[PDB]
Design a protein around this nucleic acid. Structure first.
Ligand SMILES: [Mg+2]
Ligand SMILES: [Mg+2]
Ligand SMILES: [Mg+2]
Ligand SMILES: [Mg+2]
Ligand SMILES: [Mg+2]
Ligand SMILES: [Mg+2]
Ligand SMILES: [Mg+2]
Ligand SMILES: [Mg+2]
Ligand SMILES: [Mg+2]
Ligand SMILES: [Mg+2]
Ligand SMILES: [Zn+2]
Ligand SMILES: [Zn+2]
Lengths: 402, 402
RNA sequence: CUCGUAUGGCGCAGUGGUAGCGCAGCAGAUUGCAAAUCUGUUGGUCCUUAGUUCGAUCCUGAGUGCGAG
RNA sequence: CUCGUAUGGCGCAGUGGUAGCGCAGCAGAUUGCAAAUCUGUUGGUCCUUAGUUCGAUCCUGAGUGCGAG
């Protein structure tokens, strides 16, 4: 049936570079899945693949959103889906590339459609959702469908809110909605994971930040600051739209010697991003696709043509030819990356909550752990210990008085 | 979503035995997938799991077909499908068990519906399908849609015929029909493969044949012979319905000291069956389900409870709990069975035909190899060699004639 | 003692010029027969020995094994 | 050869009773913000040393190291 190739991996691994090679070799068009590359201009910091390096290969769902808009999952689901259909009905093979692996969920119905589910929210309902209270909306969720509230921490406002929002608009318990999800892969998809040891990568990711400024990043930064300014925007705005990009918010303090710091801070955010990306691919993506993925070692660039190019072409060739892949699925070196221990084994299965009646956070609320394993990690934490001691001593001082 | 557990494996591995344990533990009902256990009575030779060993667990699509009927794929697809639906709408989890792994294809749309595709075959069309000629129906296929004819040998009458039959009833090239198949798994299925080293198994399969007669197999054999008789049936009938079962046709010659031979011949057929079953599971089933299967070592029965019972329960438990399986998927010992080299690597990919203009079979037709690899195997065969020599020597007597 | 046979794991051909078939075995196939079906392929040097002959697995002699007498 | 100053990976506080803050780091989460966000958490017992006091990072005196005319 209609095939679809997807390329995943961390930043600066050659995803775009590969995507092009395959596109040419197999007659296809690229579809960006990077949540930040969907915005207008600002190519240097948003690291868009230059045109004179696309061999004319068509690109979709990329650079079209106005800095005034707020892109998101569904916006991608509809857009990415159209590109697929369109590319397919033209005898071409789609190729989705990006670092926002979260969006990839659309490729296998891992979402909840609440748009076609019209329902005028009630004054009572809304007043709860948009409540100014800290942990009140959570209690509401625990009340209606506690089997979903237990899968979230009482502080995960963004998510706890979403869940309740669903319960309202759909009038159906979100927990149930999930148990009923089919979660089946859409289209005969081929997941290619381009990977590279963290050390070598981190180095490249750093240098690619240096000559990233040399190419005139500061110009795009000031530009972004001009728009940021003349708009009365506060730093807390850097949690929406383009304002989330890694390459702007980091230099905000340099916009009130020290610019050098904003650069380091940026190099760090990038580093962390790459790390969180692997974690997702290993604990979220792979487990979701039952492990039907193929690794490509791009650690030693001096090679690439062999480890990435050829291998990717080899697998893709058998793939498109509508045949069972004979390739090893993973080179000896990265073999353990697809192991159960490195993947589904790490996923949290115990959701029972625990509230330490002795420890409390800066927000005043008492610490609440999820899962017996971590509940204990906390009990043995110096935090809990140091606090359990001061508590005992205070309680003891009185014992002595008597 | 609606889960479905399936248990595959060779004969005498404990599939039924396991199916029951799971059924109880997880509240489910068994669905037989054995093409021979679907017939009436004849339990000893058809090895039906005894009732007083089913703990009252419901069984479906098993023992209901009259010896006068001819069960087949679709017949199973509809029947198996109903049981699933029915079991599901009752809060129960279906458990399909059997050795006819071929039928399992229904679990992931690996067939072609040609019943709802009514079309009065033409006198010209029919005269070709039911042609008395040896290799004429094949030529017709090569004419219309040669891309499918090349995937079959010109002697595979049963299949070449079906392909052409499809081309007619559907008026759509069968080759195309396949390239368009989605081949997606139906229901959240869990494939459990109960395996056992061939040697220990072969031993059990043999003794299993001895006390199989002691339980009164000959009584069922004579019974089958009574019906076989008084019906003017010839041995060539043993290619249809129950007549295919392993436990009857083998004793036909003993029905015109020598019975001992018919028993050996049976132990062999069973042995071969077990071998062909593994080959299917490794080269057909697994490759088709992308390798989403879990092995259970039942080689050392003294264990079972640990390697089979517990493990199966552990995996099934996480499965039914709608959670990503944390189990290893394969015990160190049988690890290599799920390797690419032992599976998709063996599947034939080269379909180019080759006709040895020198070698010919008993039917007169010239040998035709499929796949360069095997084309060569033939060229170096003693058959081809011995024949190429007599041919040269005879031609060398022509030069001497000048 | 009569007359017979002695070929790859087993059951069988064959020819005065250095051997095939079936079965098992191994392997590929499998989209209404699948416990069925199709297809490809590895094994011996024709029991030992002395001769006849240009040359013997096949012809004669003997030995040995086995077969019904 | 007289003054300063050294506390977890880095950067800096600090009470006489056996230690913090910021970063990193490590871990769990993710079904309309995901380059985001939520959550949990490992590292040192305070340069070494003589003592001063019931007691020591925090007091007194040496020595090590760096910086300072
Ligand atoms: Mg890119
Ligand atoms: Mg703009
Ligand atoms: Mg390169
Ligand atoms: Mg048992
Ligand atoms: Mg059974
Ligand atoms: Mg009957
Ligand atoms: Mg076999
Ligand atoms: Mg013999
Ligand atoms: Mg002579
Ligand atoms: Mg001291
Ligand atoms: Zn605590
Ligand atoms: Zn030949």
């Amino acid at each position: 049936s209609k095939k679809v190739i997807v390329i995943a991996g961390t930043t600066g691994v050659g995803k775009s570079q590969l995507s092009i090679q395959l596109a040419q070799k197999f007659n296809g068009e690229v579809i960006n899945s990077d949540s930040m590359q969907v915005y207008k201009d600002i190519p240097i910091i948003t690291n868009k693949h230059p045109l004179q390096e696309r061999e004319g290969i068509p690109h979709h769902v990329m650079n079209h959103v106005d800095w005034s808009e707020e892109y998101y999952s569904h916006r991608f689901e509809t857009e990415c889906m159209n590109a697929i259909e369109d590319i397919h009905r033209r005898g071409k093979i789609p190729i989705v590339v990006g670092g926002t692996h979260y969006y990839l969920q659309t490729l296998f119905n891992k979402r909840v459609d609440t748009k076609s589910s019209e329902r005028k929210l009630t004054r009572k309902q809304l007043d709860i959702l948009e409540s100014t209270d800290p942990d009140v909306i959570y209690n509401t969720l625990v009340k209606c469908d506690p089997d979903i509230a237990t899968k979230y921490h009482p502080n995960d406002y963004r998510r706890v809110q979403r869940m309740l929002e669903i319960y309202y608009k759909t009038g159906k318990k979100p927990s149930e909605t999930f148990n009923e999800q089919k979660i089946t892969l859409k289209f005969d998809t081929l997941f290619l994971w381009l990977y590279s040891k963290p050390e070598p990568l981190f180095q490249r990711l750093d240098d690619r930040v240096d000559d990233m400024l040399e190419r005139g990043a500061l110009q795009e930064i000031k530009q972004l600051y001009e728009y940021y300014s003349q708009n009365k925007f506060t730093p807390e705005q850097c949690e929406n739209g383009v304002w989330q990009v890694i390459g702007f918010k980091e230099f905000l303090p340099w916009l009130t010697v020290k610019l050098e710091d904003c650069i380091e801070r940026m190099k760090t955010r990038t580093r962390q991003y790459a790390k969180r990306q692997v974690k997702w691919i290993k604990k979220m993506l792979i487990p979701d696709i039952k492990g039907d993925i193929y690794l490509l070692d791009a650690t030693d660039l001096s090679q690439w043509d062999t480890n990435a190019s050829q291998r990717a072409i080899a697998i893709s060739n058998d793939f498109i030819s509508n045949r069972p892949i004979k390739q090893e699925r993973a080179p000896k070196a990265l073999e353990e990356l697809l192991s159960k221990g490195e993947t589904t084994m790490k996923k949290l299965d115990d959701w029972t909550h625990y509230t330490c009646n002795v420890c409390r956070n800066a927000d005043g609320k008492n610490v609440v752990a999820i899962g017996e394993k971590y509940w204990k990690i906390h009990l043995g934490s110096r935090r809990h210990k140091s606090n359990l001691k001061r508590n005992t001593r205070q309680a003891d001082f009185e014992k002595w008085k008597i």
